[PDB]
């Protein structure tokens, strides 16, 4: 028999960025698993003013935002023939310059916000911390030990969005063989917390606590083993600026007419991103669902550049968990058209048009940062100068069984035994290391 | 040793919507699994007449379809400046008004037609039904206890389409780091029974019968424990109206010219859906494959609105199996172009154009209908006031092992014990309940 009863925070009215404490009572003869339930409140940004044409202001991450004059390039210094600049919303709705309280930035969340929240978890018994991990071991366990059959539920618990499928009308096709057919197109979309929205509704997070006795139902420690009043759980919640972020709410639209034959019209866009103020997020219904039952051979290593988590990274919310060097590939789809006004000379079109989209399509590409890895010991060399992909791909693929999933990132490595990690690197910069020694 | 014998229907020439009976013979010392094989015949619609401009007729689900006059809105009463209405096919091929036998509607199937066919299965031994389940337990079984690796075969057996992946030519990209590259685009398409087609080829369906002894090879009941002539299998096949549906074969094209500067041209579409007659579908090669071998702790609960299966639902064929409140999101992609005819004043384009597609892109979004669920007991409260996502997501994720998959619908809940289901909703309407008590 098991009953899920609740425990209240001992500190009282937690806040985002300060220590939080739970006191474990002895209700059942054993306790099996720990789940923390939190409800983050609503979010939005503050109103801002529209700029005046010709203005340059200091944006975020040391970037200069500008609203160029007519006949000049994006730097407001280099002449251009026929450029004209106006202001628009992210959806194409116009804005008049100089208007007070004219627009708001959009707000979105981090990826897997339920994993960044618990930056540090400690289990204390009158001091003498029995166990302690960070928000890096959790990334390793989700990249390795989660079956993947049960990933939809996990992505629902930690507030990560999932894509929804849709279809189009029937379409005609011409088959070839060495004929006609009717087929449908399939598209995907997203609507979760990570999509930039004007107003973010409250977010419910369930976070599981992973101690060595919580892995199996037969290994859970009793509640009578150690005196009653000494059990405590301490958690260091992450700050607000490491959870939510802003997306531009104003864009500058450039229209350029190029004279000649064919005469051409080009329309392009550029963000005007000036940071605003996001209201304080309040945690409510902070509960711990303690469960009361009633009566080495593996190492995962993650090497993460410090650029991933630095506050100066414009994409730290996306890349805070990736183990590798992340670059971005940008595609900009365009609508093109050509028109001829007469039938005298028609070799070249009389007019052309190229219409862009307000925001581009961005693909994050992760690349390895390690060429050779060696984990030596005082006895012998053990692993010595093995290639990266041998540890990254082949070892999970062969060993492990159905428990260990093959990871996706090039920086997550696995080595089998039955402690000095050195590596050869073509990447210049600091490198963080995360370890997790488990036996199966 | 094992071979599959065939059993013929006892009733004789089944039809869609009538009882069907098999008589189990004693051929081997045991029978393990039973599969019903059916072959539904071809389908198509009847020829119809094209309308006359200005006509209004009552369509399906009490909706009024109209063919407006020139200079009027979609209601044929409100004036509009320059609207012009013509008739087209779903693929843009024109149709002349008033033509006799000018078009046909398209026909498609339900989703998972192999599961809706067996609306009721009974195992009789001179009466005294040993087991009986509906077409709702099967949906829970597929949403919970199917591994996921074996879903391609299952979707092939019950006649559910699977998407096919294609690629495009090489394209140029510009990389950014804090360079050029060649990449490809990946698309998906469908061609199965659920795609509206003029002519639907015959569909072969294999349906597995699930009784308590069919789960394991060691638990199959013998064929001698019960007298020979008393064994019977009864199946109530679903009607033809609950299996196939129609899609419009005629569309009304509206073209509007808006005068001024820029002068604008807009093209939009609206269906003209008037129901027709679908011929009778005949079952052939109706066989039962009996295997002849030769010598509580879980509950799945589904909360389904009655709107999902109601005959007045325009989308009942899509949503007959979804456990939740289903809404629809519509995207309408558009081709846009702007052209300037001269170089005197070029601030604004001289002409614009926006072209729409004939059919939109529809995304089905499912939302929960339960806020709190409690399954009380005569002795104690048992589960009391737990949130919906605790039972929908966390319980499958933690308990179950590799057998239980985490579901995708917000209305499918699972609770563990080692019978009065009440709930709190913000939804007004009738709610259906399905249960399946299993032990593992």
């Amino acid at each position: 028999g098991f009953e899920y009863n609740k425990v209240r925070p001992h500190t009282g009215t937690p806040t985002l960025g300060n220590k939080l404490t739970f006191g474990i009572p002895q209700y059942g003869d054993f306790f099996h698993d720990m789940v923390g339930h939190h409800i983050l409140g609503a979010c939005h940004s503050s109103w801002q003013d529209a700029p005046i044409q010709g203005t340059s202001q200091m944006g975020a991450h040391g970037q200069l935002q500008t609203f160029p004059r007519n006949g000049y390039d994006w730097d407001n210094q280099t002449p251009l023939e026929g450029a004209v600049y106006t202001l628009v919303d992210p959806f194409g709705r116009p804005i008049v310059p100089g208007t007070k309280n004219a627009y708001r930035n959009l707000v979105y969340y981090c990826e897997y916000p339920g994993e960044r929240l618990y930056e540090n978890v400690r289990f204390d018994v009158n001091g003498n911390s029995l166990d302690e991990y960070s928000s890096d071991v959790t990334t390793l366990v989700r990249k390795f030990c989660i079956p993947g059959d049960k990933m939809t539920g996990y992505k629902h618990l930690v507030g990560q969005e999932v894509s929804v499928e849709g279809t189009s009308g029937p379409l005609l096709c011409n088959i070839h063989d060495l004929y006609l057919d009717i087929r449908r197109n399939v598209h995907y979309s997203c609507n979760g917390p990570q999509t930039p929205k004007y107003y973010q509704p409250p977010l419910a997070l369930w976070i599981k606590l992973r101690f060595w006795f919580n892995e199996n139902v037969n290994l859970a420690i009793p509640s009578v083993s150690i005196p009653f009043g000494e059990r405590f759980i301490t958690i260091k919640l992450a700050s607000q600026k490491d959870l939510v972020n802003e997306f531009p709410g104003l864009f500058v639209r450039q229209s350029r007419f190029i004279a000649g034959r064919p005469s051409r019209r080009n329309i392009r866009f550029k963000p005007w991103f000036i940071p605003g103020v996001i209201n304080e997020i309040s945690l409510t219904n902070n509960e711990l669902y303690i469960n009361n039952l009633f009566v080495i051979e593996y190492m995962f290593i993650g090497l993460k550049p410090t650029w991933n988590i630095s506050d100066q990274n414009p994409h730290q919310h996306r890349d805070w968990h990736k183990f590798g060097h992340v670059v971005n590939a940008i595609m900009q789809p365009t609508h093109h058209a050509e028109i001829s006004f007469q039938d005298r000379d028609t070799a070249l079109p009389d007019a052309c048009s190229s219409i862009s989209d307000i925001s581009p399509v961005t693909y994050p590409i992760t690349l390895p940062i390690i060429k050779n890895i060696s984990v030596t010991a005082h006895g012998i060399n053990l692993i010595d100068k093995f290639p990266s992909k041998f540890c990254s791909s082949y070892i999970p693929f062969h060993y492990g069984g159905n428990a260990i999933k093959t990871p996706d990132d090039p920086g997550a490595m696995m080595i089998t035994f039955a402690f000095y990690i050195s590596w050869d690197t073509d990447y210049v910069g600091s490198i963080t290391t995360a370890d997790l020694v488990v036996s199966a | 040793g094992f071979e599959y014998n065939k059993v013929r229907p006892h009733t004789g020439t089944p039809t869609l919507g009538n009882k069907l009976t098999f008589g189990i013979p004693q051929y081997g010392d045991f029978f393990h699994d039973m599969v019903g094989h059916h072959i539904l015949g071809a389908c198509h619609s009847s020829w119809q007449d094209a309308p006359i401009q200005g006509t209004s007729q009552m369509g399906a689900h009490g909706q009024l379809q109209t063919f407006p006059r020139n200079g009027y809105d979609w209601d044929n009463q409100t004036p509009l400046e320059g609207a012009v209405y013509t008739l087209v096919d779903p693929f843009g091929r024109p149709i002349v008004p008033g033509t006799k036998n000018a078009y046909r509607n398209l026909v498609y199937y339900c989703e998972y037609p192999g599961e809706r066919l067996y609306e009721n299965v009974r195992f009789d031994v001179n009466g005294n039904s040993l087991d009986e389940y509906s077409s709702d337990v099967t949906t829970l079984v597929r949403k919970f206890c199917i591994p996921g690796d074996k879903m391609t075969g299952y979707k092939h057996l019950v006649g559910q389409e699977v998407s096919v992946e294609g690629t495009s030519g090489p394209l140029l990209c510009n990389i950014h780091d804090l360079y050029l590259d060649i990449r490809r685009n990946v698309h998906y398409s469908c061609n199965g029974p659920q795609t509206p087609k003029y002519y639907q080829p015959p569909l072969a369906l294999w349906i597995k019968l699930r009784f308590w002894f069919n789960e394991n090879v060691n638990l199959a009941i013998p064929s001698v424990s019960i007298p020979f002539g008393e064994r019977f299998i009864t199946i109530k096949l679903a009607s033809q109206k609950d299996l196939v549906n129609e899609f419009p074969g005629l569309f009304v094209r509206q073209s509007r010219f808006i005068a001024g500067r820029p002068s604008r041209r807009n093209i939009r579409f609206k269906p003209w859906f008037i129901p027709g007659v679908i011929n009778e579908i005949s079952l052939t090669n109706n066989e039962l494959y009996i295997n002849n071998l030769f010598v509580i702790e879980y509950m799945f609960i589904g909360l389904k609105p009655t709107w999902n299966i109601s005959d007045q639902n325009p989308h009942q064929h899509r949503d007959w199996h979804k456990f939740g409140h289903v809404v629809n999101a519509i995207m309408q992609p558009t081709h846009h172009a702007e052209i300037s005819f001269q170089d005197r004043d070029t601030a604004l384009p001289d002409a614009c154009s926006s072209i729409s597609d004939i059919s939109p892109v529809t995304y089905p979004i499912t939302l929960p209908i339960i806020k709190n669920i409690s399954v009380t007991a005569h002795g104690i409260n048992l589960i009391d006031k737990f949130p919906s996502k605790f039972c929908s997501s966390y319980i499958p994720f933690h308990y179950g092992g590799n057998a239980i998959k985490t579901p995708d619908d917000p209305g499918a809940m699972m609770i563990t014990f080692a019978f009065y289901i009440s709930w709190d909703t913000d939804y007004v309407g009738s709610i259906t309940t399905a249960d399946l008590v299993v032990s593992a």
Partner: antibody
Amino acid sequence: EKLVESGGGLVKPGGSLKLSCVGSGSTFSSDAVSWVRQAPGKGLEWLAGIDGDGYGVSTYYADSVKGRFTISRDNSQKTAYLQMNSLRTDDTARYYCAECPMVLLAKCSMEFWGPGVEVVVS
Amino acid sequence: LQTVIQEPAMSVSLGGTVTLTCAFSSGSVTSSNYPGWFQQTPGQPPRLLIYQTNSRPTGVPSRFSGAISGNRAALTITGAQAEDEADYFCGLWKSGTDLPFGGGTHLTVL
């Protein structure tokens, strides 16, 4: 981007006059035009101005000339017109155009100037 | 009334540094008034030197600077030359539909 003024000359008191300003730029239709005047021996005084295409076009006026002056645009011929009614003896001055590199006229720049035409009222 | 005042005349030695000032009658000049500075060589149309209190259009030397000092608008010329002998005007954008100019200050380079 240059400007040429025309239509200025001696006007009998109580009459009306029209001044034309011709531009030869690549963005004249997207630029805000304005009219400024300078009495002999005094400082510049701003009179009227119009917006550019891209938003709702509107005309703004000062307080000493509202109701007597009217500013109009013609993008097809690249021209701006000022019509002055009921000229008084205290309007003998020199009138310049001023085209900013901006669409709206509120808080403008007024970079480019024309040579101007000497209008006399007597 | 909101009227614009500045010094009637100033003087400077060749190669020196001289600062001209511009102010309202009662209010306080801030960066939201977007002051502009104009130069008018006699017999010539006015030429724009400083717009938005800091920016220079192309073709203007870097020896001209502009700023807001306390509640005043200041234009600083460092390293004066012979050609700088001219009149200077300050134009302030009060409200959104008024641009009252200044009296005009003659600069004398001895």
